Design a protein around this ligand. Structure first.
Ligand SMILES: CSc1ccc(O[C@]2(C)CCN(CC3CC3)C2)cc1
Ligand SMILES: CSc1ccc(O[C@]2(C)CCN(CC3CC3)C2)cc1
Lengths: 546, 546
C-alpha cells in the first residue's frame, strides 16, 4: 500500500532533460556520437561530475574540469573540437531552456492532496554562475509543492549509491513498499527497485502518469483543471506598520519585483486574495495583501470618522511612506475597489497603476445628496440598514459561521436576497440557520474568516458605509480631474449589486481605461473565478505596470 | 521666541527652482523675456496654474492649457514659437533636474533635533505623468524629516492666499511670532510677515542660513558632518516568518529594489543596523534587517544544536523561501559575518552577493580540533568561558544596562579587556558597576538593547558559540570549494578581536574578493563609523549587486 511518491528533477519534474543537451550538441556539431556524454561521466565515482554532484566542488569550479575531459575524449576519438566551443555556453543554455513539466507537477499535487507524502530526490550541483538565479527561481517554485527536497550536493551522497535511498526512506519515515519512485535513468531506478519500492522508468510523461495512476489507484491523467495555488496563513510572511498612534496595518507579503498592493472589500480579509498571492509573486511581483482598516490583524478603532475615504487613503500613503515605497500598483475589490479609484484621483504620484474588480469608478453627483442617490437604486437599500450603529453589528456578529456561509456563495447558490432588507428588517430573516457549504469554500476557509472576525467584529467594517456625506464632499474636490495613469476595470457578469453596466460611463473620466470581463462570476470574484482573475491581472500587470 | 520652522519646497528645500527653467528656456530659445513665465501665470487666480496648484486639475490636464497660454502670449508678443516646442519636455527635464538642497535640509534637521516643530509648505500639483515616480521619490525622502508636509493641491488653498497661512498656524499649534518662514518668492513671504511671523527671503542658501542662525540662535552653518539617518523602532515595518513549528524570525523592512539581508553579531539586534537601513533603502535597495535566531523578537529555543551553523543557514534559506525571494545579498557583521560566508559556500544560488564587516572567512582546519585552534589564539580565550551552559548567561543577565554599556564602546573608551577572562573568571571582574556612556550610543539606544534582551536573555545568543565541533565537521565538507560569487571584506583597524590581518589569506579561497577598510574603527563597526560603512556598502552594491 502506497503513501509516498518520489520524483526526480531532470527529465521528470523539469524538461527538456539538461542531460539531453550533450546528445543534441553532438548532433548539432557533427561530433562523434557519445563524445560529450562520455567526457561528462569520465572517471565515474572519483571523476569531476561525481565530486560536483556530491557538493565537493561548485559548478564554476567544474566547468574547467569538463573542458579538460572533452579534450582527452576528443584525442582518443581522433577528432578535433570546434574553434568556438564553450561548455559554459552549452550548460547556460540547457539550464535556462529547462522548464517545469506542468502535468508531472499536477500529478504530484493531486497525490499530496490525497494524503501522500511527496519528495524530490535529485542529483544536483552548487550553482555559483552569474546566471544562477534562473535555476534558484525554478527550485523555489517547485520545492514549495513538496514535503521534502533532497539534493545530492547537500547530502554529500549521489544516485545510484545505496546510502541515498536509505536516507530517502528515513526522511520519508516509510518502508520501501509504501513508496513510488519515478526516475528517467534506469540505473538510478534499480537501487529503489532492489529495496522493494515501486519504480517507474519515465520516458514520455503520459505513459509515466498512466503507470502512476494504475499503481496508486488515483486518477492523475485527463483530470479537471486544478485551482491556482492557495495560501496557508501560517506559512506567510506577516507584516505590521503603525500608521498613527492608535492605528496599525497588517499585511501578508510574498515575492520580489514591483509592489502590488491588494485591497479587499466587505466583509473580507487579506485571505480573500489567497489564490492571487502565489500567482502574482510567481509572475514577478512583490505582493502586499492588506487587512484593511477595521479587519483581521489591522487596527479597528470604534469612531465612524476613522473610516471616511480621506482618512483611509491618507493612511495607505503613510503605509507606503513607512515601508519606504515611492509607489505600488493598487488592485482593489468591492470597498477596496472604491479606495483604489480614490488613491488614483488624490495620490497619482504614489499609484503605479490602478485596477478594480467589480467596483466601477462613479464620480460624486454634486446636485444630489448620497441619501437621494441611494433613493434611485433599490440594489443599495441594505446600505440604509447599515447606517444605525449597533443594528447590523448584532445580526452579523450573532453567528459568524452563519454570516460567512450565507454571504460567500456562487451566483447559483444564493440564500440572500439583499432586497427589502428594509421590508424584511434583517440580512438573514428568511435565510437558513445552517446554510449549506458553498462550492467556492471549504469549512476550514470559513473558520479562518470566523476566527479573524472574533477579534474586532463588524463595527470597523460597517463604519466604511457610515461616511456617505463626508466621502461625497471630499469626492466633489476631484470633479474637474481625470484618471490618466494606467487603469483596469474588471467586470463580473453575475454580480447583482456591482453590475457590469454600472461601469459603462468610466471612459468619460478614464479615457485610456483597459478592461476585463468574467462571465458566470458572482460578487466574490477572487474565489469564484481565481484562474481567470489571475490571467487578467498578470496580463495587465506585464503590459501596463513594469 | 521661536519654536517652529517652515520651509518652501521649490527654490528652498529643492534646487534648481523648477520655476527658474522658464527664464532659462526663454534665453536658450532666444524668445522675448518673460514670455514663458507670463504664459505660466496667465489669468492669475482663475488661471490654469492656480487650478493646478489647488488640486482642481492634474499636471497632465494642465500641460495642454499651458501650451494654449504660450500661443496667446506669443501672438501678443509678435513672435513665433519654435517648431519642436514641448511644455511636457521642458517640465519633465526641470523636475528631474531638481534635487534636494542638502545644506537647507541639514539646517531643518538641526532645528528639529533642538526641539523645533518643522514643516514644508508648498504650492504643488497632482502628478500623473508617466515619469511621476522621480518626484514621488523626492517627496518621500524629504517628508520623513519633517513634522508636517502641507501641499496646496491637497488642502485646496494656495500661497499667497491668507487662508493657507491660518491653516499652517493651526496645524503647527503655534502663534505667528513663534514661527520662522523661509520662502524664495517675496509675494508668498508677505502674508506670513503681515501675520507677524519671522520671514526669510531665500536667494542663495548661505545668506538664508546666516539669517536663520541669527534669528534662532542655533548654529546651522559650518556645522560638523551629521550622523546618517537612524531608525525609530515604532515607525518601521516589522515582519515575521515562521521557518519551522517552534521557530519564527523577525525582521525590519524598508525600501524597494534588490533584497539586502542584514545579519547582526553577538550580542546584538536588527537595531545594530539603524544607520544603514534608511541609507541603503534611499540607495535603491529592499532592506531586510534580521533579529537573528536567539535575539529580540525572533524565537530563542533553549537547545544548543538549534544554533549550529548548518541549522542557522537552512532556516535563512527557509526565510527566503517563505518570503518568496529567489535571492538576497547577504551582509553580515561578527557572528552574522560568519553565517554570511557559509551562506555563500553552501547556498550560492540563493546569495546574490556576500559582504562581511570585520569577520574574515577562515576555512576549517582538518588537522586541528576547534579546541586546539582556540589554543593558538589568546584573543579567543573568552569563548572557552562561553562553553559551560548557564555561567556567562548569569553574568551577562545580572545587569543588562551594565552589559551593553560595557560592551558597546569605541576603540579609545574600552573598559573590557577580553583577556584572561579565564584568569579573571568573568567578563566584568575589574570593570565598573556604572560604566560611563560611550560617545557611540545614547542612553535611549542602550535601553532599547536592554528591553530586547529582557525577553530571552543570553542563552540563545551564547549557544551560537557552543557548536564548535558540529560547525567544524560541517565546514570540512566545503574544503574543496571556492567562493566565486561577488564578495566584499570590510576590515576594521581597531577591532582587537577580529583584526584586519586575520583576513590576509581570503583571496586563496575568494579570488575575485573586493575589499574595504575603516581606520580608527573598533568592533562595533556600524555605530562606530556609520557614514563610512554606508559609503563602502552602497558603492559595492551599485557595482557588484544589481
Ligand atoms: C455610492 S458608490 C458605492 C456603491 C456601493 C458601495 O458598497 C459596496 C462596495 C457595494 C457592495 N457592498 C458589499 C456587499 C457585500 C456585497 C459594498 C459603496 C459605495
Ligand atoms: C573560529 S572562527 C570564529 C572566530 C570568532 C568567533 O566569534 C566572534 C565572531 C568573534 C567575536 N565574538 C563577538 C564578541 C563580542 C565581540 C564573536 C566565531 C568564530
Amino acid at each position: 500500500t502506497l503513501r509516498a511518491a518520489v520524483f526526480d528533477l531532470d527529465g521528470v519534474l523539469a524538461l527538456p532533460a539538461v542531460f539531453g543537451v550533450l546528445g543534441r550538441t553532438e548532433e548539432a556539431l557533427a561530433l562523434p556520437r557519445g563524445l560529450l556524454n562520455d567526457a561528462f561521466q569520465k572517471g565515474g565515482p572519483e571523476g569531476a561530475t561525481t565530486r560536483l554532484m556530491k557538493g565537493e566542488i561548485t559548478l564554476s569550479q567544474w566547468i574547467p574540469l569538463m573542458e579538460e575531459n572533452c579534450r582527452k575524449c576528443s584525442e582518443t576519438a581522433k577528432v578535433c573540437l570546434p574553434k568556438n566551443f564553450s561548455i559554459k555556453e552549452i550548460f547556460d543554455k540547457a539550464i535556462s531552456a529547462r522548464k517545469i513539466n506542468r502535468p508531472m507537477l499536477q500529478a504530484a499535487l493531486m497525490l499530496r492532496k490525497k494524503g501522500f507524502t511527496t519528495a524530490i530526490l535529485t542529483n544536483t550541483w552548487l550553482d555559483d554562475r552569474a546566471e544562477r538565479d534562473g535555476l534558484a527561481q525554478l527550485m523555489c517554485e517547485l520545492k514549495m509543492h513538496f514535503d521534502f527536497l533532497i539534493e545530492s550536493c547537500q547530502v554529500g551522497m549521489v544516485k545510484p549509491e545505496p546510502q541515498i535511498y536509505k536516507f530517502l526512506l528515513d526522511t520519508l519515515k516509510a518502508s520501501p513498499s509504501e513508496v513510488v519512485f519515478l526516475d528517467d535513468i534506469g540505473a538510478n531506478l534499480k537501487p529503489a527497485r532492489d529495496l522493494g519500492m515501486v519504480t517507474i522508468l519515465v520516458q514520455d510523461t503520459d505513459t509515466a502518469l498512466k503507470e502512476l495512476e494504475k499503481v496508486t489507484g488515483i486518477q492523475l491523467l485527463n483530470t479537471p483543471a486544478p485551482l491556482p495555488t492557495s495560501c496557508n496563513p501560517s506559512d506567510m510572511s506577516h507584516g505590521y506598520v503603525t500608521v498613527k498612534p492608535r492605528v496599525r496595518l497588517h499585511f501578508v507579503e510574498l515575492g520580489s519585483g514591483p509592489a502590488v498592493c491588494l485591497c479587499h472589500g466587505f466583509p473580507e480579509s487579506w485571505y480573500s486574495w489567497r489564490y492571487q498571492i502565489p500567482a502574482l509573486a510567481q509572475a514577478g511581483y512583490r505582493v502586499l495583501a492588506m487587512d484593511m482598516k477595521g479587519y483581521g490583524e489591522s487596527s479597528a478603532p470604534p469612531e465612524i470618522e476613522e473610516y471616511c475615504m480621506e482618512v483611509l487613503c491618507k493612511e495607505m500613503v503613510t503605509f507606503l511612506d513607512k515601508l519606504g515605497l515611492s509607489q505600488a500598483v493598487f488592485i482593489g475589490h468591492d470597498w477596496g475597489g472604491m479606495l483604489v479609484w480614490y488613491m488614483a484621483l488624490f495620490y497619482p504620484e504614489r499609484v503605479r497603476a490602478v485596477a478594480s474588480l467589480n467596483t466601477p469608478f462613479i464620480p460624486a453627483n454634486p446636485n444630489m445628496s448620497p441619501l437621494e442617490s441611494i433613493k434611485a437604486n433599490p440594489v443599495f437599500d441594505y446600505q440604509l440598514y447599515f447606517q444605525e450603529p449597533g443594528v447590523a453589528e448584532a445580526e452579523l456578529e450573532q453567528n459568524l459561521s452563519r454570516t460567512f456561509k450565507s454571504l460567500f456563495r456562487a451566483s447559483d447558490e444564493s440564500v440572500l436576497s439583499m432586497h427589502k432588507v428594509c421590508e424584511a428588517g434583517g440580512l438573514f430573516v428568511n435565510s437558513p440557520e445552517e446554510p449549506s457549504l458553498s462550492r467556492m469554500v471549504t469549512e476550514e476557509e470559513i473558520q479562518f474568516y470566523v476566527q479573524q472576525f472574533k477579534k474586532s467584529g463588524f463595527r470597523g467594517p460597517l463604519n466604511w458605509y457610515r461616511n456617505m456625506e463626508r466621502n461625497w464632499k471630499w469626492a466633489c474636490k476631484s470633479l474637474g480631474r481625470k484618471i490618466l495613469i494606467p487603469a483596469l476595470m474588471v467586470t463580473a457578469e453575475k454580480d447583482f449589486v456591482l453590475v457590469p453596466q454600472m461601469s459603462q460611463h468610466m471612459e468619460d473620466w478614464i479615457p485610456h481605461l483597459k478592461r476585463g470581463h468574467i462571465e458566470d462570476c458572482g460578487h466574490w470574484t477572487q474565489m469564484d473565478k481565481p484562474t481567470e482573475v489571475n490571467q487578467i491581472l498578470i496580463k495587465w500587470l506585464d503590459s501596463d505596470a513594469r
